Design a protein around this ligand. Structure first.
Ligand SMILES: OC[C@H]1O[C@H](O)[C@H](O)[C@@H](O)[C@@H]1O
Ligand SMILES: OC[C@H]1O[C@H](O)[C@H](O)[C@@H](O)[C@@H]1O
Ligand SMILES: OC[C@H]1O[C@H](O)[C@H](O)[C@@H](O)[C@@H]1O
Ligand SMILES: [Zn+2]
Ligand SMILES: [Zn+2]
Lengths: 285, 285
């Protein structure tokens, strides 16, 4: 399922929700965990310091963070969770992270994103954005607030040629995971656009007809996988509207998106409006 | 100076601060203005509509927006400001925009960014980010709040090999513009990092010494251009700290940044914290 998870350690605080998520997963689906932290002190480049001194600072930071990470993780290690700690020196974390993924062939990246308030959107940093856009493996952004009780997984699917295969991957992988992880109920959503009242003046047959195709496309899919109709949703509106309203209404613990350095308009507009975890999945091909 | 400006029309509202900025500029530095608006209605792809109907909708939206833009801009046209209106059909605005730039060899892109409240950061959309990262020409993000009275231009410069040339371009271009535009006073800032109290335990000689180099580097530069020392700043801290504190303290109307799809850490971290216009300049080479 995901046997090789990379958790990106957040240097700015002791608690590591991304690691906590990784352990939660491990104990249910197996798989190894690399707890990975790239750091730097720019003062590492400022003929102002000795060569020896540059080294002692660089080596001293590696050792200290490693022990700190091990302190955070002690219970998980003593519990016998297979966690490898890698702190590395690198000035560009997202590049560091993506090179680690490729080197260690990681099949999942987990990284914390902060939500300051329950009313608001999860804050995605620039690093987060570079990951989401560019990281080859799937990327799971782990909101630092509690998982809603009985929270659902919501998968956005595209309903309007080979987009068929991408949709299939997305639903396949989400289902195999939700089923080995506490049987989280999985829902599907497709939003269809209704023509702005503005564009109109250039026919509400449009409405029923488009609603028609999408329902057909949803069913075909639902059924390639024996999904219940009741967990499948076909909605009028902008994706960035529909998906987070439906997330709130469903108490979705996570939203799962598949991609088109650019995720496609749906994903770009949506991601900035999420109030729960995000999982981004790119076509492996 | 900038003889070929592209203003990205914001479809979501009537008032166009980016165009208003473009006119403001024109009447002081000359140059032509293309008022550019890419649009689409996804319903344009949904065998659900006639070929004729797809066209009538597509052609009808082009014509209507064109007249709307002309309505917004009437006073500027009647005033005799040289404004070409281009509305085009394209599903990816940032791609549309960047292709227009290359096609029309635009030397400046202006586009509005919204600040919801004076206390907060200007909201950069995903499109804004793609532009800032990828658009070949300079990109001027025009905050939709008033320009501070006597507002200054603040230029971030790098102070720690060929970074010399990039710095030079940045200061040259900002100065030639501020001087033909109302003589906006230009300031320079370089921030130097102080080693976290945390990294320490692995010498406040560091402090004075690093402060030293940067002052030397600042002066060399200031003086390649006969800049007053009093408008030049060398500060301890994170760039994302120093630059917006100094912006607030200075009443800087705009912050000018030069780049390293990635602007370099300084620019990435800073941009998300700005409370004023932004101008991004990439090495032409
Ligand atoms: O949204 C404001 C954010 O800005 C700062 O980085 C704060 O330290 C963080 O707690 C907060 O959520
Ligand atoms: O979508 C592009 C994103 O790039 C940046 O990293 C910003 O953190 C965010 O405001 C923006 O939305
Ligand atoms: O920050 C919240 C923003 O969200 C919405 O897009 C609002 O319409 C805009 O007025 C506001 O500034
Ligand atoms: Zn917070
Ligand atoms: Zn607002």
């Amino acid at each position: 399922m995901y046997q090789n998870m990379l958790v990106v350690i957040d240097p700015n605080q002791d608690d590591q929700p991304a690691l906590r998520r990784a352990v939660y997963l491990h104990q249910r689906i197996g798989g190894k965990i690399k707890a990975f932290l790239p750091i730097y002190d720019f003062s590492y480049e400022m003929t102002l310091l000795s060569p020896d001194e540059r080294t002692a600072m660089r080596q001293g930071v590696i050792s200290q963070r490693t022990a700190w990470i091990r302190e955070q993780a002690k219970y998980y290690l003593e519990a016998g969770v297979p966690i490898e700690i890698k702190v590395v020196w690198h000035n560009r974390p997202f590049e560091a992270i993506i090179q680690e993924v490729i080197a260690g062939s990681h099949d999942l990246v987990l990284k914390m994103a902060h939500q300051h308030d329950r009313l608001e959107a999860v804050i995605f940093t620039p690093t987060d954005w570079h990951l989401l856009r560019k990281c080859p493996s799937p990327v799971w952004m782990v909101k630092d607030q509690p998982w809603p009780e009985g929270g659902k997984a919501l998968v956005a699917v595209n309903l309007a040629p080979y987009h068929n295969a991408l949709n299939e991957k997305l639903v396949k992988e989400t289902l195999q995971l939700a089923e080995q992880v506490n049987h989280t109920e999985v829902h599907l959503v497709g939003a269809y656009p209704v023509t702005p009242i503005n564009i109109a003046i250039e026919p509400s047959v449009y409405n029923d007809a488009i609603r028609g195709q999408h329902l057909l496309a949803m069913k075909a899919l639902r059924q390639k996988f024996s999904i219940d109709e009741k967990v499948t949703h076909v909605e009028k509106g902008l994706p960035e509207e529909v998906i987070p309203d439906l997330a709130e209404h469903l108490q979705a613990g996570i939203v799962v998106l598949g991609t088109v350095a650019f995720l496609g308009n749906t994903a770009e507009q949506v991601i900035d409006h999420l109030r729960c975890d995000l999982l981004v999945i790119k076509p492996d091909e």
